[PDB]
């Protein structure tokens, strides 16, 4: 229903967790889909072609 009061739904979640329970921050960033926490693996394997 927090989802039938806004059509008058499915939005519910775009909210990417911000900080953990103990309230430690996840330094998410803007855009909310990328925490400025970079990791070797990903980059290499997952993202940067040849650069």
């Amino acid at each position: 229903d927090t989802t039938t009061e806004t059509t008058t739904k499915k939005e519910l979640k775009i909210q990417p967790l911000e900080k953990d329970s103990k309230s430690r921050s996840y330094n998410v960033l803007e855009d909310k889909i990328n925490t400025a926490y970079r990791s070797w693996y990903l980059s290499y394997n997952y993202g940067n072609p040849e650069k």
């Binding site: 693996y41 290499y44 394997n45 997952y46």
Partner: protein, 204 residues
Amino acid sequence: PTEASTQTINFDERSRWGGQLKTIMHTNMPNVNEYMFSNKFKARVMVSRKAPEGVTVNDTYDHKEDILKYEWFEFILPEGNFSATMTIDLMNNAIIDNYLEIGRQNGVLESDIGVKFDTRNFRLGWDPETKLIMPGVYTYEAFHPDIVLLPGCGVDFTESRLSNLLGIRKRHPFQEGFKIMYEDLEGGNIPALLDVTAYEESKK
């Protein structure tokens, strides 16, 4: 080094010769590097579903069953070296990791994924008479990698080795008619499975 470079070790003559070359060497190869093509592979999944332009009722169930679309894809993996299976799922993910992106968005149903590597002896739980799998379960047992297909979809390894991992290999290992289509797995269709509960209720 340089200067040295010039100077010469001088093995002599008035009689040539040779040597005994022994040698030590080590390496760190990740079972799934791309360089050894334990990285890529081809196969085609469903990518579209509809019915010619008018949505429902008489064929509301049957309409869904009237237009399918297929396309060939080269999907890859995250280099590393993994457990027998691990590897599998990775593809059996990245295979999905394709669907997701295109299937949802084009009426394709998870139902019709159409390409799922996996080990298991679907048919073991068979029975002659029902001509089905009496325990309502493809009895969850590892037997040896295997690739299950839907219609039209297939899998080509030509450009990869994982094949040799899937312990499945061409019998004339030196050409290329090597791709696997619904069509080839003749007779090897899953049995279907049976309904437990119903069988039970009506047990009296």
